Amino acid sequence: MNTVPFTSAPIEVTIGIDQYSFNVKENQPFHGIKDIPIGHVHVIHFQHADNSSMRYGYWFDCRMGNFYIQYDPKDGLYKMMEERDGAKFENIVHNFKERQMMVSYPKIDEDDTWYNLTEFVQMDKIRKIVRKDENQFSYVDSSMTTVQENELSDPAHSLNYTVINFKSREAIRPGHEMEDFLDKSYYLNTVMLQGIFKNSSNYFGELQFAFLNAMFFGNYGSSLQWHAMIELICSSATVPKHMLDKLDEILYYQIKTLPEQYSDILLNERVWNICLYSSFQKNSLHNTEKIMENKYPELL
Amino acid sequence: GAMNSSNYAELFNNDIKLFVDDTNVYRVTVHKTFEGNVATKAINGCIFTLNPKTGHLFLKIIHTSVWAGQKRLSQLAKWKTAEEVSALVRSLPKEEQPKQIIVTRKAMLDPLEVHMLDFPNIAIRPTELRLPFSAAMSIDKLSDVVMKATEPQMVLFNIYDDWLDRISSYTAFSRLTLLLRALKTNEESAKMILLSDPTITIKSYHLWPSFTDEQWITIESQMRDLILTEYGRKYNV
């Protein structure tokens, strides 16, 4: 188990760690989060009590170093930093634990929710989508734009998602115009799976990453990316059998974990109804179909 | 954006554009089988591709053989239309290629867009206008060359005959849409009007009769009257 200590908490803020969150009062004696499960990536995120605008946060993997949070009063936000001096860091942590000023990552033992949401998410791959190579952790916020959004302005602050475009030359083979547009299997299997992502694990990794950024930060271009990667699969007549079964599990836990009051802006009516009721794979998403109907039957 | 009553006049500026109408591409007679089931038999169709400024009509005849052994023909027809329109553009010299293509039915947008990916600077536009181009098969010479075709074939016409020697594109397009609106709403009456006088003839190289300017006004009037009456009948007003 690992720890992310906080220097202090000077401004009142809601802090999330994965799917958990805690309210911290201005200058309350808060000094970090302990008992963080090793072996998965994690995200620690923030929403200030005074500007409910700009949710922001850090993707990180505790196996890649010692990380802490420090408020910056010039830039006005909680920053993630790496401590390179290992003894200095254990010392800080042990002292804060001894004073019981840390919250415990509150995982129920029966619960596999976070595993299931982050199964294919890889921290080393996260750093190729969020490019800032002097840090081992990755910053994301509500407002950041994706590479594709920028095409249709600052490249350093961009989410480099895999551009997916159903009316593009990458998607449509010359002479198979109709074939490839109505059955995207060529684009899924040859262009994207074999060409770009190399395997399905990677594809699912980006898809889960995009969903988590949409849910935790309300990042709109991430939501567009998650829906696009679902639609590419659902619009392919030929999908490996193991991918369909795993897709159903992925989407189930994403729909399960969504706040009930956010389905209006995070869920795209057209994509879901087409994936569940019109597409080739309309019959291959039993769990995801069952949870969608019992929990959001309005959308459909 | 979409073409409508408000940007109507853009059709007659000097940027090349084409209308594409696919209504008559896939044509069937529906009939009964020996066992009492219903079956379709296709007949030849055409793509109606028109430059509204010049009157040049690119009539691509769609021979029934293009449907042989194919499923979901009404869906295929939209892609075949898009394939043929794209092939036409590629066949034209660069300075003759359109800057816009306006499809008369919105279901053509995606098929045409995908087929024209090689021409990113050609705008594919829908329209809110209810244009009467389905009535093109009520023009005898167009109907005749489509039905007689024994293979795929492109036939070129000027749908305005020689009208542009005497009138502008705007007025010629209005005359054309009025003639086609009348033919669409009551073909029998519409055609009675155009040929009633055996002394007015159609030149071998034309589609419509050689009316003087004054006879065109009498014609156009008679075509309006037909269109209104039919409307009171249609709706009882």
Ligand SMILES: Nc1ncccc1CO
């Ligand atoms: N595997 C992944 N995990 C997180 C972001 C992106 C990818 C795709 O390479």
